[PDB]
Every structure is written in C-alpha cells, then in structure tokens.
Design an enzyme around this catalytic site. Structure first.
Site, PDB file in Angstrom:
ATOM      1  NE  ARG B  47      64.813  21.002  29.621  1.00 64.33           N
ATOM      2  CZ  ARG B  47      64.196  22.172  29.506  1.00 64.33           C
ATOM      3  NH1 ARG B  47      63.793  22.846  30.587  1.00 64.33           N
ATOM      4  NH2 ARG B  47      63.928  22.648  28.286  1.00 64.33           N
ATOM      5  NE  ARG B  81      59.943  19.347  30.341  1.00 64.27           N
ATOM      6  CZ  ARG B  81      60.018  18.145  30.921  1.00 64.27           C
ATOM      7  NH1 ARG B  81      59.736  17.029  30.253  1.00 64.27           N
ATOM      8  NH2 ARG B  81      60.325  18.067  32.210  1.00 64.27           N
ATOM      9  CD  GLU B  85      54.200  17.583  27.526  1.00 71.67           C
ATOM     10  OE1 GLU B  85      54.330  17.970  28.695  1.00 71.67           O
ATOM     11  OE2 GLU B  85      53.584  16.553  27.230  1.00 71.67           O
ATOM     12  CG  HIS B 142      55.804  20.491  31.067  1.00 70.46           C
ATOM     13  ND1 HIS B 142      55.994  19.200  30.745  1.00 70.46           N
ATOM     14  CD2 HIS B 142      56.713  20.786  32.071  1.00 70.46           C
ATOM     15  CE1 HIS B 142      56.973  18.688  31.513  1.00 70.46           C
ATOM     16  NE2 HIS B 142      57.411  19.655  32.327  1.00 70.46           N
ATOM     17  CE  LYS B 169      58.803  17.730  36.009  1.00 72.20           C
ATOM     18  NZ  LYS B 169      60.286  17.557  35.838  1.00 72.20           N
ATOM     19  CB  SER B 231      65.745  25.344  32.953  1.00 70.11           C
ATOM     20  OG  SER B 231      65.213  25.032  34.243  1.00 70.11           O
ATOM     21  CD  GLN B 235      63.757  27.367  36.530  1.00 68.77           C
ATOM     22  OE1 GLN B 235      64.927  27.721  36.316  1.00 68.77           O
ATOM     23  NE2 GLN B 235      63.263  26.227  36.084  1.00 68.77           N
TER      24      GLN B 235
HETATM   25  O1  LIG Z   1      60.673  24.963  36.604  1.00 65.32           O
HETATM   26  C1  LIG Z   1      59.948  24.691  35.632  1.00 65.32           C
HETATM   27  O2  LIG Z   1      58.896  25.343  35.419  1.00 65.32           O
HETATM   28  C2  LIG Z   1      60.313  23.552  34.722  1.00 65.32           C
HETATM   29  O3  LIG Z   1      59.511  23.655  33.531  1.00 65.32           O
HETATM   30  C3  LIG Z   1      59.935  22.273  35.476  1.00 65.32           C
HETATM   31  C4  LIG Z   1      60.335  20.996  34.761  1.00 65.32           C
HETATM   32  O4  LIG Z   1      59.520  20.773  33.609  1.00 65.32           O
HETATM   33  C5  LIG Z   1      61.795  21.011  34.316  1.00 65.32           C
HETATM   34  O5  LIG Z   1      62.038  19.876  33.488  1.00 65.32           O
HETATM   35  C6  LIG Z   1      62.150  22.287  33.550  1.00 65.32           C
HETATM   36  O6  LIG Z   1      63.551  22.230  33.252  1.00 65.32           O
HETATM   37  C7  LIG Z   1      61.804  23.534  34.360  1.00 65.32           C
END
Ligand SMILES: O=C(O)[C@]1(O)C[C@@H](O)[C@@H](O)[C@H](O)C1
Ligand SMILES: O=C(O)[C@]1(O)C[C@@H](O)[C@@H](O)[C@H](O)C1
Ligand code: NI
Ligand code: NI
Ligand code: NI
Ligand code: NI
Ligand code: NI
Ligand code: NI
Lengths: 251, 251
Positions: B47, B81, B85, B142, B169, B231, B235
């Site tokens: 990240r 990131r 977002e 996101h 994703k 992150s 999680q």
């Molecule tokens: O697990 C997630 O929800 C995340 O937001 C998924 C993905 O966007 C990753 O880049 C993030 O570090 C963690």
C-alpha cells in the site's frame, strides 16, 4: 428472544451446533451415542425415523433412555422426520402425535421436532402439550429438491411462530448459487421484521455450506455438523464448525 | 478465466489471500517485510499511499526493491489507494499515473492496481503499458459510504473488463445486512452473465466479513486478510482466514 434448554441459551452468542444420531436398534443407538459422547456439540438430535418399529413406544423410550444414560449433559431433541420431508418412514397423523406425546411424557427429552405441514390443529395442541411438560418445540419444514421464493420461506417461518413454535426451522435445497442467497435473504427479513424468537435456517449441499457458518450475522441460531469422519456434502465436522463459528464470533 | 502471477494461478481452487504491507519509510517497509515473512498468504500488496515520499520515484523504487529482497517467493502487487477512494494520500491524476508507470518500468512488481474512475483514456493507456512489460492489472473501485445497487456493481465490473483489467475488483460498504447480500448477488450475476476472467469482490466492515470468506462459492477469486493490523475494515487475521477458506474448500 432466546430459548433456554437446560444450561444452553439458544439465540444468544455464537450459533449452536446440532448433530444427528441414527440407529435402527437399541444396539445401534448405543454404539452411536458412545461414539458421539466426547464430541464438541451443543444439542443431540435423535432421528427417530431411522429406528425400526416406532409404533412400539416402549422400545423407542428404552432407546431414548439409553441415549440419556450415555450423553448426560447435552439437550436431547426427539425428531421423527416423515418420509414426505426426507425421512425414512411414514406414520399416520395419530401415530406421529402419539409418538411425540409419549416422548414428552417420558421426561427423557428436552425438545421435540414437529413438522409444520402435519396440520394446524394437531401441531398446536401438541405444542401446548409439550409446554405443559416443560419440553421445547422446534417446528420444521424441509424441501430437499428446491428453494422456494424468499416470500414463501418467510411465510412458513411466520406461520411456525403463529403456531407456537419455540424455534422455527427451515432447510431448503439450492439448485443454483442464487437460491443460497434467497435463503439468506429470507433469514435476514424474518429476523429483522417478524421474528420474536430464535430461528434456524439452512441451505443444503456443498453450495449452501455458507448458510451453516453465517448464522450470527444473518440470524440463524443453530446449524448442523457431523461427528463421523465420513460425512455428507455440506456437513462440516463439528470441530471444524466450532472453529469457524468461533472465528466469526470473535472477529 | 485464470490469471497466472509467477506460480500462483488466480481463479482456480480456493480463493487466494492477499495482505497489505503498510510502511511510511524504507526502514518501516523493511521491518514490516521481515514480519510478513512469518505469515501465510499468496500475494503481497504494498500500500504505497502509506509511504511518505511517494512523489520521489527513486525512493519508491528503493522501497519496492527492499520488499523484493526480503519477500522473494510471493507476487508483489503495487497499490496506491487514493484518498478519494479510502486511501491515505491524494495525488494529481498525472502523479498517480506516472507513479504506476514507474512501478511497471522497474521490473520489481508483478501487478499494479489501477482505479477505474481515474479516467478511461489514462486507464487504457496504463493497462497497455503494464501489459507491454508483462505486469498484470487489478482494476479497482471502492465505495466507503454505501453499497450501490447490484446492477451498478455489475456494470462497473463489466467496464473494468472492457478497459482491459486482468482482474476486476470492487469493495463496498454495507449500511445493512441486506447490502452484504446485494454485494454477493452482484458477484454471482457478474460471474454468471459477463465474467471471462477472475473477479474480486468484498463487502467491508465486520458486517460484511462473510463476503471475505465465501468467495469460492459465489465467485470472488481472492480475499484480503490482516497480518497485524487491517488495511480496510472487516479483514480478519490471515491465519484464521486460511483456516476458514480451507474448511469451506473441503466442505
Ligand atoms: O480488503 C479491502 O477491503 C481492501 O480495501 C481491498 C483493496 O482495495 C486493497 O487495496 C485494500 O488495501 C484493502
Ligand atoms: O436434518 C436436517 O435438517 C439437515 O439439514 C439435513 C441435511 O441437510 C444434513 O446435511 C444436515 O446436517 C441436517
Ligand atoms: Ni463470546
Ligand atoms: Ni402429564
Ligand atoms: Ni407455551
Ligand atoms: Ni419436490
Ligand atoms: Ni482442493
Ligand atoms: Ni520499459
């Protein structure tokens, strides 16, 4: 909100684990109870429909007594699953009710299973009979071939509540991945809008396995696991089930 | 419908575990990489938005190099990131694109993450540039405030495929339990109707945790676990994550 059977509080904390015991004779039942004795589960379901000559109440009760002698600290659920709902044999309504009332009278079982589709009159009076004797009722419905629409799943669960079930229970078979989501949708709607007591819901087969693990978030109070090494599609071993339910609870 | 990154084949078998490494300085990055050697995961996401000197390309590449010296047997995913977002720092579109192009050029990363809403032209050009260097692209979106309708989630994943993403994703935030099911529905519908490559989906926060565990049945090819700290909300610890994925995989 919750249903307490012995020291076990259903509807609070992590979902509870139910295991099913099947035996044709008292010797089979004893063998199974001994094999189950040290396993980590919460409720023992005796699948009475696998027992031979259930119309001889005394034989059934001797077997129930044998289970209680071996498994002394787990609530015992007495379940005669009719052939029309996936079970091994069929009884007339009278015989089915007589059997369940005999179980209630024995003082050996903590809960009985009554099938929703047995008939309102008979079901409701037997719920009253069980309550007089401090025995809880799980009212059940199963569709082993398909998944009804969410609205119909909710309707059945609401009807079980109306008939006095302590714990409404429904198990359905998914034909597609969407059917699994349909079962979870019904669980969420029921638990959030209509439920005033614990419910048990599950989607069968490997495809529906997530329904056995997601009870704490979506609203299912219990699920079924296997004790035997050799289990069936979607039946997680009780140790693994406990492991996953604990992870979700402690997350 | 599979993507191979080193020896890892994404889109086959149990979902793959991704963990995020977060360090401010090259010193922190090296220290975290050491710790992460002792965790069980499949892909290492760096990240980059947590890194302080992101506008200095040489520092960024030194950090990436340091990770590669410590974590040698795992694909490395480069992810800045954007604050917009849910990330830690904002960059101009130009800075963001050049950062990723620099990562692609280094030969140190196996994949980069590109945010879908950065701009079609920029995204397409950057995907082409990654592919020219045999770097895979995870395209992402996101929503940290809500869960768009299932159809909108599907159309975003479809768009990612059109723009040439190797792995679409999407991560969304549930406001209710039904929103978790909405995310799972979109996953299934995308898989059934339009997916010709692996996709990654997740409903964030503790409420959506089940979405991080049920990817094998509903269609999500990878899931994020936490080593020491998460992150993103929801999680769970990486060891527990593997345990649950394995139990479900064998169910
Ligand atoms: O697990 C997630 O929800 C995340 O937001 C998924 C993905 O966007 C990753 O880049 C993030 O570090 C963690
Ligand atoms: O008896 C049931 O309701 C069951 O759901 C039947 C079948 O699905 C088994 O796999 C479950 O363990 C229990
Ligand atoms: Ni607790
Ligand atoms: Ni009496
Ligand atoms: Ni009563
Ligand atoms: Ni049928
Ligand atoms: Ni396998
Ligand atoms: Ni080049």
């Amino acid at each position: 909100k919750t249903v307490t059977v012995r020291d076990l509080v259903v509807g609070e904390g992590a979902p509870k684990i139910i295991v099913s015991l099947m035996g044709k004779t008292i010797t089979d039942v004893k063998s199974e109870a001994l094999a189950y004795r040290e396993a980590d589960f919460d409720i023992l379901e005796w699948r009475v429909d696998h027992f031979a000559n259930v119309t001889t109440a005394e034989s059934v009760l001797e077997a129930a007594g044998a289970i209680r002698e071996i498994i002394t600290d787990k609530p015992l659920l007495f379940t005669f699953r009719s052939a029309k709902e996936g079970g091994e044999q069929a009884l007339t309504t009278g015989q089915y009710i007589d059997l369940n009332r005999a179980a209630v009278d024995s003082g050996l079982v903590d809960m009985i299973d009554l099938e929703l589709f047995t008939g309102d009159d008979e079901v409701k009076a037997t719920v009253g009979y069980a309550h007089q004797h401090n025995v809880a009722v799980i009212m059940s419905n199963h569709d082993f071939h398909k998944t009804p629409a969410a609205e119909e799943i909710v309707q059945r669960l609401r009807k079980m509540q109306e008939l006095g079930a302590d714990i409404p229970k429904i198990a359905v078979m998914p034909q597609t991945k969407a059917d699994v989501l349909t079962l979870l949708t019904a669980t969420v709607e029921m638990q959030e809008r209509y439920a005033d007591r614990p419910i048990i819901t599950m989607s069968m087969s490997k495809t529906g396995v997530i329904s056995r693990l997601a009870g704490e978030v979506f609203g299912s109070a219990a699920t079924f696991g296997a004790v035997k090494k050799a289990s069936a599609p979607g039946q997680i071993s009780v140790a693994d089930l406990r492991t996953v339910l604990t992870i979700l609870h402690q997350a």
